[PDB]
Amino acid sequence: WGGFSVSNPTIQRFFALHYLVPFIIAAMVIMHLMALHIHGSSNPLGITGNLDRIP
Amino acid sequence: MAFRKSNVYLSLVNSYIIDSPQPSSINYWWNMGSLLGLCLVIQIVTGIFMAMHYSSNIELAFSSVEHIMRDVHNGYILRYLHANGASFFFMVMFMHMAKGLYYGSYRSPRVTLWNVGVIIFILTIATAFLGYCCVYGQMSHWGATVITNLFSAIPFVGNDIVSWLWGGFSVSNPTIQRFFALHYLVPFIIAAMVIMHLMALHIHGSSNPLGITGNLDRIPMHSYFIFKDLVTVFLFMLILALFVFYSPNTLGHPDNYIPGNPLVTPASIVPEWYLLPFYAILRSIPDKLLGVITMFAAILVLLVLPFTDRSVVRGNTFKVLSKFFFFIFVFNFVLLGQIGACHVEVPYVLMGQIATFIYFAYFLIIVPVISTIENVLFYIGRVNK
Amino acid sequence: MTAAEHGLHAPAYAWSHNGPFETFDHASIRRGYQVYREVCAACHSLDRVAWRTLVGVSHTNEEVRNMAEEFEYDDEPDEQGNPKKRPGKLSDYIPGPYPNEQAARAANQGALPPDLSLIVKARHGGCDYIFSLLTGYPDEPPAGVALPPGSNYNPYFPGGSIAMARVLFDDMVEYEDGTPATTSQMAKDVTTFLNWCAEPEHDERKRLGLKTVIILSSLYLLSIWVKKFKWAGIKTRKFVFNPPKPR
Amino acid sequence: WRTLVGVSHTNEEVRNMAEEFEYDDEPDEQGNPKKRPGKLSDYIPGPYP
Amino acid sequence: MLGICTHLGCVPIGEAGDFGGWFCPCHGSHYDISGRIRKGPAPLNLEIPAYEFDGDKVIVG
Amino acid sequence: KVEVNLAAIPLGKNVVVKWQGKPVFIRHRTPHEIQEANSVDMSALKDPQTDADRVKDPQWLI
Amino acid sequence: PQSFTSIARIGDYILKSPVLSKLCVPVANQFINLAGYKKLGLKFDDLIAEENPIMQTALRRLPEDESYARAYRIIRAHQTELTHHLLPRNEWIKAQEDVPYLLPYILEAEAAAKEKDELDNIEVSK
Amino acid sequence: GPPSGKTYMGWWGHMGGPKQKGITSYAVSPYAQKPLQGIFHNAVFNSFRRFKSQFLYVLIPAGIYWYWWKNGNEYNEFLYSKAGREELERVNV
Amino acid sequence: GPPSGKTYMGWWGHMGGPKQKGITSYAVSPYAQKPLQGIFHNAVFNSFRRFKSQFLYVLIPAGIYWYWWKNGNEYNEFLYSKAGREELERVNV
Amino acid sequence: SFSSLYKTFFKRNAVFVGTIFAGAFVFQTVFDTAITSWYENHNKGKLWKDVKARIAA
Ligand code: HEC
Ligand code: HEM
Ligand code: HEM
Ligand SMILES: COc1c(O)c(C)c(C/C=C(/C)CC/C=C(\C)CC/C=C(\C)CC/C=C(\C)CC/C=C(\C)CCC=C(C)C)c(O)c1OC
Ligand code: FES
């Protein structure tokens, strides 16, 4: 809280954090895409897709 | 294989700071890059914790900084760390760029790495300017007035760009809230362009003080340069702690403790010390349009270097004339800053015009002419013809 | 520019808080507040200093309670919405002599007396400039200068002419501790007090810098030994060349 | 007041409406409080202080 | 007219010195009612703002 | 902490003030209503709470 | 970036003029002595930047025994610089040993590259 | 992943230098050595050698730009003094 | 750079599937074809085929939870009216 | 013995790390107390506590 209840210290620090977390999200999306690029995506048939691929 | 090489995330750590093959001959001048990484982390963390107590309204900006010093616990430590840390940021960066100028690190195989560094230099200058304006003292308000008024010299569209930048008719409340939002964002662009800086270095690796190939003798990064970087890391915080706890206002200006007033000119107006050399170049041209263009040229001429060096040897280690004229440029840079903090007087006007000429003549005249002469001296000094 | 419009440079005095191991003289801080209240407070403000910050530095908790209760502060309106007033408390700020800036310029021949909460940090010279300005009024202006009416002469002020007149005269304040109050003694005490107003963290900052430098200097020495130990094999390494036979 | 012009009233009509109220002005040269009639840049005043 | 010295910016003191003009105490130059600087390194004359008339009155803008 | 005195409140009216971000009540007490609070139900309806700790100033209940 | 063909053209003209060979060479010998690469166990031909396609063919065509020796001198200099010392005075490269061993392999590779460029821009006199 | 272009550095085992033959190397464990060997000797004699070889390339440019600065400071001070009023009008005007 | 661990996808030319033999494929250029061909026929007959085979897996769960919601909503309206005030006492307390 | 010293504190990393943490806890409290004591003694007669008791005489 920064005090005894929800007050001026709380609102001012919540805006500083609302600015920061989106840039952390952008960093975890890259880690998300890096782990996908290992084996590639899946398909609705649930079987291997190595026999037919398109760019 | 080892888990540090097979994992998707650990393999990026292993390939960059653990198993990276480094030349065995690199000296302590190759330690400034790791220091710049610690400076960027220090500025981001102290800025975020200070931003929880800051207000960007033009009627509350100055008082919110005074609130941080007095009321916030350990708040003066954060503020003096952030203000002095930015001064040490430019100290290391100036030495980092002069190392590569001395050792020919801009040459052919690594032109892309050099070009990305110039972009980081431009962004860092903008970030420091925007944060200085957020204090809203007497030197930050009047410094912002002169800097943003130079865009009005652009033909046709010049006057409209200033109004769009100000958000009004002068430096007012819309400008100050504009600059704090940009001061939060630009450091994250720098962090993303630093990763592109390391990607372009990994293709060919680092250079060495001798200027020749380093593929014959390499040692891993971990436990050899991890502990050599730790030596300058501890020395870096020792000098910073001296300036933070025993002399926190030696690198500043006393006029920035007077709240911003648009009705009283603060006598001489100067920027921070690390922008002073470029401030003197702008004032040396008796023309607003031409003088403004020359100021960004001084950063863009660094891209001409890989093509005006006509030498077949990389670096200045074994070059007699190139070593002498290198320090002429270095001390010419220091004299330019002194003129930037001086008044417009009889001797100082011509001193800054000649020193401006030497700055540009070094890249375009001195380096091409000197490098061709030394090539012949190396040849005729050993061939029996 | 000329040295007249630059202003004479203040000399260097041996302040008791000068030095890496030195703190403020808290007896001069206590004496300096009395000079401010009886001489300075008629025309200057200290609006960045709260009453509570004086407790434990130069006054007791009960003393500051009686000091603040002599001023009237605005209160919340009553049940019918009419305005009210109340005596001060420890959480308030030291009030100024004027309601607005137009009132201040009207009482000072159109000149504005600046606030004195950061004046030590806002001038080139610090404590040496405030002391020299308060004790540097000559009885006569140098032969040749032409002062505008309503302005005084002081060599330490940039330009020469200053809108503030001499205000410190011998034996104008009666200190409680029996110290002879002279022009130099009062100018020295009020400057120490104003320095504490600008930097109230001075005492605790210097104590933290001693711990930081001692710890950081040990680490720098320890890391040199560790680096040389890990590099011992590479530093002492030998190479021999024996040319191979042609094949 | 300026937001009613061109929506429900004329410029010359809104000016008359605003001039029937009183707003705090800048203090005079002696520092006393002053009053002035309203302008288009003012906001619609309420009944209670 | 604008109350700024035409050289580097200053403040005009009200009706003091010269031909009943005003005073630029930044360096020691004065003014006149015509707004014509009589001494100093001023390159040009004082600038006037744009304005209109309420018949006989004066506005700023 | 708040510092409000009790020498400016009459007898027989509620006063509600805000402290620490939450409101509180205060009002002068009456002769027999507090004695009724002594005679009020002990523990047969909701809460086994005595009037010993609820009020420490028999003329103000906050 | 200045080609060795151009360097040799200027140098050979100087070395055949009796007046020009009298003042330039004495100051060129002092320039080489002050450069100080011989005190690390190096010849000048070991300092040429090798990350261009022209110098990659020259090092490929260098005879095998000369290539083994060059690798030792380069490794020796890196170890000497690592200690911030110099080589003992008896291990310094002498003037009669500082010969341009790689120069003929560079001038020949450069001549072949120049002829290729002139043949991609050929114009038959029709 | 696709292949990349041609660079001038490799990795361990395929670094990309010339073939090495005939060079032998010897080393001793750091646990069996004295890390601080010769620090006092190097701090004086090695330090003097390093300084004596480079101090002429730094001091001469520094002294040229310091003599220039001091000569320009004294001239400005003389110009704005009572004895320099005859020169200030003939230069700055 | 060093090589990484073994994965289950490769790249063009070494994708890592089984060896293929005896399969021929034919295709025609889109510039000589008719896009939108058969959309009207597919918009009614193909859509009915797809809807019929899946609508029972979606609608039966949807109808079960919707009946539960309406029944529990109607009971709440009964307890908070005059008709069901007696039951509200027992069920609540 | 030097063999027993290695076997107790330097053979297992868990004991080595735990010893560093327990030595940092003791150093933390002792270092602070010894610093204020020297700092206060170097400025005797200038502290509020000193002047408060003097005027209490
Ligand atoms: C009692 C001790 C006292 C101190 C200490 C003090 N004042 Fe001032 N003071 C002024 C005015 C007016 C100025 C502005 C001078 C100017 O701008 O030319 C000023 C300026 C100052 C300055 C700024 C100096 C500078 O360089 O700008 C300081 C510091 C200061 N006063 C401190 C009216 C007063 C008056 C009313 C007569 C009194 C009393 C007075 N001042 C008493 C004091
Ligand atoms: C935040 C800013 C920067 C960071 C974090 C950074 C980081 C690094 C690091 C870690 C290295 C390798 C280690 C080293 O050589 O010391 C490096 C090398 C290099 N940097 Fe930077 N750098 C920055 C800015 C710049 C700038 C402004 C320039 C030039 C204008 C630049 C040009 C170079 C060059 C040329 C190299 C290679 C030099 C060599 O290896 O010989 N960098 N950088
Ligand atoms: C490379 C990164 C940064 C640099 C170089 C930088 C630079 C500066 C500078 C020079 C100042 C002027 C301070 C003074 O003169 O006292 C300043 C102020 C400030 N900066 Fe930064 N900054 C950086 C990052 C950030 C970030 C990321 C934030 C917030 C998330 C931030 C928040 C602030 C704030 C709130 C101030 C207010 C003035 C003060 O506290 O001193 N900074 N900055
Ligand atoms: C020695 O080897 C190295 C090396 O190790 C490193 C790191 C670098 C540096 C390289 C980089 C790419 C720099 C890395 C850093 C960045 C790109 C930017 C750093 C980013 C940040 C510091 C952002 C982190 C911010 C936060 C965690 C916000 C803090 C706020 C908090 C925790 C709020 C409190 C929480 C709550 C819930 C109230 C080198 O250059 C290098 O030499 C090769
Ligand atoms: S600024 Fe007024 S005369 Fe120059």
mmCIF file with all atom_site columns, N, CA and C in Angstrom, chain C residues 16 21-26 56-60 203 206-207 210-211 214-215, chain J residues 27-28 31-32 35-36 38-39 42-43 45-49 51-52 54-55:
data_model
loop_
_atom_site.group_PDB
_atom_site.id
_atom_site.type_symbol
_atom_site.label_atom_id
_atom_site.label_alt_id
_atom_site.label_comp_id
_atom_site.label_asym_id
_atom_site.label_entity_id
_atom_site.label_seq_id
_atom_site.pdbx_PDB_ins_code
_atom_site.Cartn_x
_atom_site.Cartn_y
_atom_site.Cartn_z
_atom_site.occupancy
_atom_site.B_iso_or_equiv
_atom_site.pdbx_formal_charge
_atom_site.auth_seq_id
_atom_site.auth_comp_id
_atom_site.auth_asym_id
_atom_site.auth_atom_id
_atom_site.pdbx_PDB_model_num
ATOM 1   N N  . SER C 1 16  ? 33.171 23.931  10.449 1.00 0.00 ? 16  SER C N  1
ATOM 2   C CA . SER C 1 16  ? 33.314 22.736  11.268 1.00 0.00 ? 16  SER C CA 1
ATOM 3   C C  . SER C 1 16  ? 32.717 21.497  10.619 1.00 0.00 ? 16  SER C C  1
ATOM 4   N N  . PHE C 1 21  ? 34.857 13.221  7.706  1.00 0.00 ? 21  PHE C N  1
ATOM 5   C CA . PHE C 1 21  ? 34.424 12.616  8.960  1.00 0.00 ? 21  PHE C CA 1
ATOM 6   C C  . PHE C 1 21  ? 33.689 13.595  9.866  1.00 0.00 ? 21  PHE C C  1
ATOM 7   N N  . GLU C 1 22  ? 33.341 14.773  9.364  1.00 0.00 ? 22  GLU C N  1
ATOM 8   C CA . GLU C 1 22  ? 32.778 15.850  10.163 1.00 0.00 ? 22  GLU C CA 1
ATOM 9   C C  . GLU C 1 22  ? 31.271 15.960  9.964  1.00 0.00 ? 22  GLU C C  1
ATOM 10  N N  . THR C 1 23  ? 30.573 16.324  11.036 1.00 0.00 ? 23  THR C N  1
ATOM 11  C CA . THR C 1 23  ? 29.137 16.556  11.017 1.00 0.00 ? 23  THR C CA 1
ATOM 12  C C  . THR C 1 23  ? 28.840 18.033  11.265 1.00 0.00 ? 23  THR C C  1
ATOM 13  N N  . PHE C 1 24  ? 27.551 18.343  11.358 1.00 0.00 ? 24  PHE C N  1
ATOM 14  C CA . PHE C 1 24  ? 27.108 19.688  11.692 1.00 0.00 ? 24  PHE C CA 1
ATOM 15  C C  . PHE C 1 24  ? 27.313 19.970  13.175 1.00 0.00 ? 24  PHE C C  1
ATOM 16  N N  . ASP C 1 25  ? 27.620 21.226  13.487 1.00 0.00 ? 25  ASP C N  1
ATOM 17  C CA . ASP C 1 25  ? 27.628 21.692  14.870 1.00 0.00 ? 25  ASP C CA 1
ATOM 18  C C  . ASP C 1 25  ? 26.199 22.042  15.261 1.00 0.00 ? 25  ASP C C  1
ATOM 19  N N  . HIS C 1 26  ? 25.564 21.175  16.050 1.00 0.00 ? 26  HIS C N  1
ATOM 20  C CA . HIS C 1 26  ? 24.150 21.333  16.355 1.00 0.00 ? 26  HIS C CA 1
ATOM 21  C C  . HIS C 1 26  ? 23.867 22.483  17.309 1.00 0.00 ? 26  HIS C C  1
ATOM 22  N N  . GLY C 1 56  ? 14.720 16.593  17.687 1.00 0.00 ? 56  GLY C N  1
ATOM 23  C CA . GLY C 1 56  ? 15.880 15.736  17.754 1.00 0.00 ? 56  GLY C CA 1
ATOM 24  C C  . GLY C 1 56  ? 17.104 16.255  17.040 1.00 0.00 ? 56  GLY C C  1
ATOM 25  N N  . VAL C 1 57  ? 17.013 17.407  16.386 1.00 0.00 ? 57  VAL C N  1
ATOM 26  C CA . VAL C 1 57  ? 18.138 18.027  15.702 1.00 0.00 ? 57  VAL C CA 1
ATOM 27  C C  . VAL C 1 57  ? 18.612 19.273  16.441 1.00 0.00 ? 57  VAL C C  1
ATOM 28  N N  . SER C 1 58  ? 17.689 20.171  16.776 1.00 0.00 ? 58  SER C N  1
ATOM 29  C CA . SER C 1 58  ? 18.040 21.375  17.511 1.00 0.00 ? 58  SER C CA 1
ATOM 30  C C  . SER C 1 58  ? 17.041 21.748  18.595 1.00 0.00 ? 58  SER C C  1
ATOM 31  N N  . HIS C 1 59  ? 15.989 20.963  18.809 1.00 0.00 ? 59  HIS C N  1
ATOM 32  C CA . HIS C 1 59  ? 14.962 21.300  19.781 1.00 0.00 ? 59  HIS C CA 1
ATOM 33  C C  . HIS C 1 59  ? 14.336 20.017  20.304 1.00 0.00 ? 59  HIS C C  1
ATOM 34  N N  . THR C 1 60  ? 13.710 20.124  21.469 1.00 0.00 ? 60  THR C N  1
ATOM 35  C CA . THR C 1 60  ? 12.970 19.017  22.048 1.00 0.00 ? 60  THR C CA 1
ATOM 36  C C  . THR C 1 60  ? 11.589 18.926  21.404 1.00 0.00 ? 60  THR C C  1
ATOM 37  N N  . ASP C 1 203 ? 24.474 14.445  7.925  1.00 0.00 ? 203 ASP C N  1
ATOM 38  C CA . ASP C 1 203 ? 25.130 13.664  8.968  1.00 0.00 ? 203 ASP C CA 1
ATOM 39  C C  . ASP C 1 203 ? 25.090 12.173  8.658  1.00 0.00 ? 203 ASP C C  1
ATOM 40  N N  . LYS C 1 206 ? 27.305 10.912  5.421  1.00 0.00 ? 206 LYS C N  1
ATOM 41  C CA . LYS C 1 206 ? 28.743 10.740  5.597  1.00 0.00 ? 206 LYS C CA 1
ATOM 42  C C  . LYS C 1 206 ? 29.072 9.495   6.409  1.00 0.00 ? 206 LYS C C  1
ATOM 43  N N  . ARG C 1 207 ? 28.192 9.097   7.326  1.00 0.00 ? 207 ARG C N  1
ATOM 44  C CA . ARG C 1 207 ? 28.403 7.852   8.055  1.00 0.00 ? 207 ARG C CA 1
ATOM 45  C C  . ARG C 1 207 ? 28.214 6.636   7.157  1.00 0.00 ? 207 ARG C C  1
ATOM 46  N N  . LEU C 1 210 ? 31.349 6.045   4.848  1.00 0.00 ? 210 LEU C N  1
ATOM 47  C CA . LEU C 1 210 ? 32.488 5.385   5.475  1.00 0.00 ? 210 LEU C CA 1
ATOM 48  C C  . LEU C 1 210 ? 32.374 3.869   5.367  1.00 0.00 ? 210 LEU C C  1
ATOM 49  N N  . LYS C 1 211 ? 31.190 3.320   5.643  1.00 0.00 ? 211 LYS C N  1
ATOM 50  C CA . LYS C 1 211 ? 30.995 1.880   5.517  1.00 0.00 ? 211 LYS C CA 1
ATOM 51  C C  . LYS C 1 211 ? 31.131 1.423   4.071  1.00 0.00 ? 211 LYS C C  1
ATOM 52  N N  . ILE C 1 214 ? 34.916 1.461   2.859  1.00 0.00 ? 214 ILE C N  1
ATOM 53  C CA . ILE C 1 214 ? 35.715 0.431   3.519  1.00 0.00 ? 214 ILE C CA 1
ATOM 54  C C  . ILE C 1 214 ? 35.413 -0.943  2.933  1.00 0.00 ? 214 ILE C C  1
ATOM 55  N N  . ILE C 1 215 ? 34.132 -1.258  2.739  1.00 0.00 ? 215 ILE C N  1
ATOM 56  C CA . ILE C 1 215 ? 33.761 -2.567  2.211  1.00 0.00 ? 215 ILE C CA 1
ATOM 57  C C  . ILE C 1 215 ? 34.166 -2.696  0.748  1.00 0.00 ? 215 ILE C C  1
ATOM 58  N N  . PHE J 2 27  ? 29.405 -10.492 10.943 1.00 0.00 ? 27  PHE J N  1
ATOM 59  C CA . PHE J 2 27  ? 30.083 -9.293  10.468 1.00 0.00 ? 27  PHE J CA 1
ATOM 60  C C  . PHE J 2 27  ? 29.125 -8.118  10.344 1.00 0.00 ? 27  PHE J C  1
ATOM 61  N N  . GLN J 2 28  ? 27.872 -8.383  9.974  1.00 0.00 ? 28  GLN J N  1
ATOM 62  C CA . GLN J 2 28  ? 26.928 -7.308  9.692  1.00 0.00 ? 28  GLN J CA 1
ATOM 63  C C  . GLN J 2 28  ? 26.631 -6.490  10.941 1.00 0.00 ? 28  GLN J C  1
ATOM 64  N N  . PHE J 2 31  ? 30.102 -4.795  12.426 1.00 0.00 ? 31  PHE J N  1
ATOM 65  C CA . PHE J 2 31  ? 30.650 -3.705  11.624 1.00 0.00 ? 31  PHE J CA 1
ATOM 66  C C  . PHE J 2 31  ? 29.864 -2.415  11.816 1.00 0.00 ? 31  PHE J C  1
ATOM 67  N N  . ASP J 2 32  ? 28.538 -2.508  11.924 1.00 0.00 ? 32  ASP J N  1
ATOM 68  C CA . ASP J 2 32  ? 27.729 -1.307  12.107 1.00 0.00 ? 32  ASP J CA 1
ATOM 69  C C  . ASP J 2 32  ? 28.017 -0.643  13.448 1.00 0.00 ? 32  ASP J C  1
ATOM 70  N N  . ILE J 2 35  ? 31.269 1.232   13.724 1.00 0.00 ? 35  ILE J N  1
ATOM 71  C CA . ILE J 2 35  ? 31.401 2.404   12.866 1.00 0.00 ? 35  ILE J CA 1
ATOM 72  C C  . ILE J 2 35  ? 30.722 3.615   13.493 1.00 0.00 ? 35  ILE J C  1
ATOM 73  N N  . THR J 2 36  ? 29.515 3.436   14.035 1.00 0.00 ? 36  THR J N  1
ATOM 74  C CA . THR J 2 36  ? 28.844 4.538   14.716 1.00 0.00 ? 36  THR J CA 1
ATOM 75  C C  . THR J 2 36  ? 29.634 4.991   15.936 1.00 0.00 ? 36  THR J C  1
ATOM 76  N N  . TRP J 2 38  ? 32.901 4.950   16.460 1.00 0.00 ? 38  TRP J N  1
ATOM 77  C CA . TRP J 2 38  ? 34.009 5.797   16.036 1.00 0.00 ? 38  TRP J CA 1
ATOM 78  C C  . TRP J 2 38  ? 33.510 7.125   15.484 1.00 0.00 ? 38  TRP J C  1
ATOM 79  N N  . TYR J 2 39  ? 32.414 7.096   14.725 1.00 0.00 ? 39  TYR J N  1
ATOM 80  C CA . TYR J 2 39  ? 31.877 8.316   14.131 1.00 0.00 ? 39  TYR J CA 1
ATOM 81  C C  . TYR J 2 39  ? 31.368 9.278   15.196 1.00 0.00 ? 39  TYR J C  1
ATOM 82  N N  . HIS J 2 42  ? 34.395 10.812  17.169 1.00 0.00 ? 42  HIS J N  1
ATOM 83  C CA . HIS J 2 42  ? 35.136 11.809  16.412 1.00 0.00 ? 42  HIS J CA 1
ATOM 84  C C  . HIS J 2 42  ? 34.449 13.169  16.418 1.00 0.00 ? 42  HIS J C  1
ATOM 85  N N  . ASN J 2 43  ? 33.148 13.215  16.695 1.00 0.00 ? 43  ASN J N  1
ATOM 86  C CA . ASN J 2 43  ? 32.371 14.447  16.694 1.00 0.00 ? 43  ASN J CA 1
ATOM 87  C C  . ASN J 2 43  ? 31.761 14.714  18.064 1.00 0.00 ? 43  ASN J C  1
ATOM 88  N N  . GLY J 2 45  ? 30.702 16.627  21.270 1.00 0.00 ? 45  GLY J N  1
ATOM 89  C CA . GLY J 2 45  ? 30.364 18.008  21.522 1.00 0.00 ? 45  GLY J CA 1
ATOM 90  C C  . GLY J 2 45  ? 29.575 18.693  20.427 1.00 0.00 ? 45  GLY J C  1
ATOM 91  N N  . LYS J 2 46  ? 29.378 18.042  19.282 1.00 0.00 ? 46  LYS J N  1
ATOM 92  C CA . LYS J 2 46  ? 28.626 18.615  18.178 1.00 0.00 ? 46  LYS J CA 1
ATOM 93  C C  . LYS J 2 46  ? 27.283 17.939  17.953 1.00 0.00 ? 46  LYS J C  1
ATOM 94  N N  . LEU J 2 47  ? 26.980 16.869  18.677 1.00 0.00 ? 47  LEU J N  1
ATOM 95  C CA . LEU J 2 47  ? 25.738 16.141  18.482 1.00 0.00 ? 47  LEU J CA 1
ATOM 96  C C  . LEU J 2 47  ? 24.620 16.751  19.317 1.00 0.00 ? 47  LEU J C  1
ATOM 97  N N  . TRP J 2 48  ? 23.380 16.461  18.916 1.00 0.00 ? 48  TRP J N  1
ATOM 98  C CA . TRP J 2 48  ? 22.236 16.978  19.660 1.00 0.00 ? 48  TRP J CA 1
ATOM 99  C C  . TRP J 2 48  ? 22.212 16.423  21.077 1.00 0.00 ? 48  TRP J C  1
ATOM 100 N N  . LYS J 2 49  ? 22.571 15.148  21.242 1.00 0.00 ? 49  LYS J N  1
ATOM 101 C CA . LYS J 2 49  ? 22.595 14.553  22.573 1.00 0.00 ? 49  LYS J CA 1
ATOM 102 C C  . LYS J 2 49  ? 23.584 15.270  23.483 1.00 0.00 ? 49  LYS J C  1
ATOM 103 N N  . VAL J 2 51  ? 24.624 18.510  23.227 1.00 0.00 ? 51  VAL J N  1
ATOM 104 C CA . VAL J 2 51  ? 24.196 19.869  23.546 1.00 0.00 ? 51  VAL J CA 1
ATOM 105 C C  . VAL J 2 51  ? 22.906 19.861  24.356 1.00 0.00 ? 51  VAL J C  1
ATOM 106 N N  . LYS J 2 52  ? 22.072 18.833  24.193 1.00 0.00 ? 52  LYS J N  1
ATOM 107 C CA . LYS J 2 52  ? 20.833 18.765  24.960 1.00 0.00 ? 52  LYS J CA 1
ATOM 108 C C  . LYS J 2 52  ? 21.115 18.606  26.448 1.00 0.00 ? 52  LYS J C  1
ATOM 109 N N  . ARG J 2 54  ? 23.898 19.512  27.971 1.00 0.00 ? 54  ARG J N  1
ATOM 110 C CA . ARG J 2 54  ? 24.597 20.694  28.462 1.00 0.00 ? 54  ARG J CA 1
ATOM 111 C C  . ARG J 2 54  ? 23.613 21.771  28.906 1.00 0.00 ? 54  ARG J C  1
ATOM 112 N N  . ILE J 2 55  ? 22.604 22.060  28.080 1.00 0.00 ? 55  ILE J N  1
ATOM 113 C CA . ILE J 2 55  ? 21.583 23.030  28.463 1.00 0.00 ? 55  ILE J CA 1
ATOM 114 C C  . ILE J 2 55  ? 20.661 22.499  29.547 1.00 0.00 ? 55  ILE J C  1
#
